[PDB]
Amino acid sequence: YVRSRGPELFYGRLRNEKSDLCLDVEGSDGKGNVLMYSCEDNLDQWFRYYENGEIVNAKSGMCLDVEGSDGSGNVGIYRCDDLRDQMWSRPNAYCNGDYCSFLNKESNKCLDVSGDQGTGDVGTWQCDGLPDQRFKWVFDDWEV
Amino acid sequence: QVLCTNPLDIGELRSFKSKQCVDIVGNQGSGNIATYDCDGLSDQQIIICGDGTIRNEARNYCFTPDGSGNANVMSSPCTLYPEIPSSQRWRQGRRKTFTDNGGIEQVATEIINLASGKCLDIEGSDGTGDIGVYDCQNLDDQYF
Ligand SMILES: OC[C@H]1O[C@@H](O[C@@H]2[C@@H](CO)O[C@](O)(CO)[C@H]2O)[C@H](O)[C@@H](O)[C@H]1O
Ligand SMILES: OC[C@H]1O[C@@H](O[C@@H]2[C@@H](CO)O[C@](O)(CO)[C@H]2O)[C@H](O)[C@@H](O)[C@H]1O
Ligand SMILES: OC[C@H]1O[C@@H](O[C@@H]2[C@@H](CO)O[C@](O)(CO)[C@H]2O)[C@H](O)[C@@H](O)[C@H]1O
Ligand SMILES: OC[C@H]1O[C@@H](O[C@@H]2[C@@H](CO)O[C@](O)(CO)[C@H]2O)[C@H](O)[C@@H](O)[C@H]1O
Ligand SMILES: OC[C@H]1O[C@@H](O[C@@H]2[C@@H](CO)O[C@](O)(CO)[C@H]2O)[C@H](O)[C@@H](O)[C@H]1O
Ligand SMILES: [Ca+2]
Ligand SMILES: [Ca+2]
Ligand SMILES: [Ca+2]
Ligand SMILES: [Ca+2]
Ligand SMILES: [Ca+2]
Ligand SMILES: [Mg+2]
Ligand SMILES: [Mg+2]
Numbered sequence A: 001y002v003r004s005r006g007p008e009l010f011y012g013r014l015r016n017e018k019s020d021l022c023l024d025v026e027g028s029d030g031k032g033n034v035l036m037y038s039c040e041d042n043l044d045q046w047f048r049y050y051e052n053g054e055i056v057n058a059k060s061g062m063c064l065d066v067e068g069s070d071g072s073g074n075v076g077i078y079r080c081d082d083l084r085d086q087m088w089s090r091p092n093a094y095c096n097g098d099y100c101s102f103l104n105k106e107s108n109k110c111l112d113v114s115g116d117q118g119t120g121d122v123g124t125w126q127c128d129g130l131p132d133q134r135f136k137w138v139f140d141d142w143e144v
Numbered sequence B: 001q002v003l004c005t006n007p008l009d010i011g012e013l014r015s016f017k018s019k020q021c022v023d024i025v026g027n028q029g030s031g032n033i034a035t036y037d038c039d040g041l042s043d044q045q046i047i048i049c050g051d052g053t054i055r056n057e058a059r060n061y062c063f064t065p066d067g068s069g070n071a072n073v074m075s076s077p078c079t080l081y082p083e084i085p086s087s088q089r090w091r092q093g094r095r096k097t098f099t100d101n102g103g104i105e106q107v108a109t110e111i112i113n114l115a116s117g118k119c120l121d122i123e124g125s126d127g128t129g130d131i132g133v134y135d136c137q138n139l140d141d142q143y144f
Helices: none
Strands: A008-016 A022-025 A032-037 A047-050 A055-057 A063-066 A075-078 A110-113 A122-125 A135-138 B007-012 B021-024 B031-036 B045-049 B054-056 B061-065 B073-077 B090-099 B105-113 B119-122 B131-134
Touching (some): A075 A122, B073 B131
Antiparallel strands (some): A008 A022, A008 A135, A022 A032, A055 A063, A063 A075, B021 B031, B090 B105, B105 B119
């Protein structure tokens, strides 16, 4: 079978409500750790979000993934192996305007930045309804 | 809308007995809930939310019973998805109504949990510290 993901819901960068930093991958390969960093106009910070729940990095073509299988731990880019821990929903309940939380299908835990200030490393954590867990899809070419 | 976008009332939540502020330890707006001097910090600005949760201006956190029986009340993450549970919802009970030295009419009421059906309470009939839930027994310290 040719694997379908459904449509194409979004294509952009993810700017953090708390810090205005961009959801970023280390280096510019599009592979490895995911962390918060300055918005840079590189393809490694652009993601495609599909109906099936996958967030696919535009540079590397691979999935926003959580360590192991539980849906709890560090987040990085990893092969898309059709698992539920690589699938995310965007519940309207945890939005504030255009800034929204990403809820992991395997653990009902939120895409999260360590601490309260939305500046550190990116993993999953309990949905706490705090600005540092909320991201806006952005379509500009802005840099810092 | 992860925030309380429809507040019924915002201000200092005082005890009818002691005239003291219901307070969260520290100034972050997370932690244990107990009475304390009114220090004018935003964590003491309590939000009586239209959805029935109780929150504060310092942090998007809910007045939460720390158990299922007669438990302590902490300020912790709001469970907002799939929907706010009954354990984190509250309602007005009976209401004493009075006029303070400011010449302003205030309305003190019981604050009843919707899961346990119990009352927001301070230890004894005037401690004057640690807050939790208890049985509703019409003492002027279970009125806020
Ligand atoms: O926030 C971490 C940053 O990491 C850099 O990653 C690469 C490392 C490893 O080789 O060293 C560079 O050569 C430095 O430019 C990078 O290729 C990224 O440049 C930053 O964008 C950022 O991801
Ligand atoms: O490192 C990210 C990847 O983690 C894998 O899980 C690892 C398993 C063994 O494969 O054991 C750990 O070392 C600790 O639990 C994990 O690093 C996942 O299978 C991959 O999907 C990926 O998430
Ligand atoms: O798993 C990350 C979690 O980090 C918490 O913040 C921690 C505090 C207390 O240890 O200090 C740090 O070391 C700063 O990075 C963190 O480990 C956050 O409050 C949680 O929301 C969560 O992200
Ligand atoms: O009894 C709790 C009180 O806590 C005060 O905050 C204290 C600050 C003082 O800088 O530092 C701590 O020790 C913790 O870091 C707190 O205990 C608040 O100012 C009071 O409002 C009150 O909540
Ligand atoms: O959890 C407190 C509850 O129990 C009673 O208050 C206790 C009495 C014990 O006789 O004295 C204290 O030690 C206060 O100094 C309390 O632990 C009350 O009858 C209940 O209303 C309730 O507050
Ligand atoms: Ca990068
Ligand atoms: Ca995984
Ligand atoms: Ca965090
Ligand atoms: Ca305080
Ligand atoms: Ca009492
Ligand atoms: Mg990471
Ligand atoms: Mg308490």
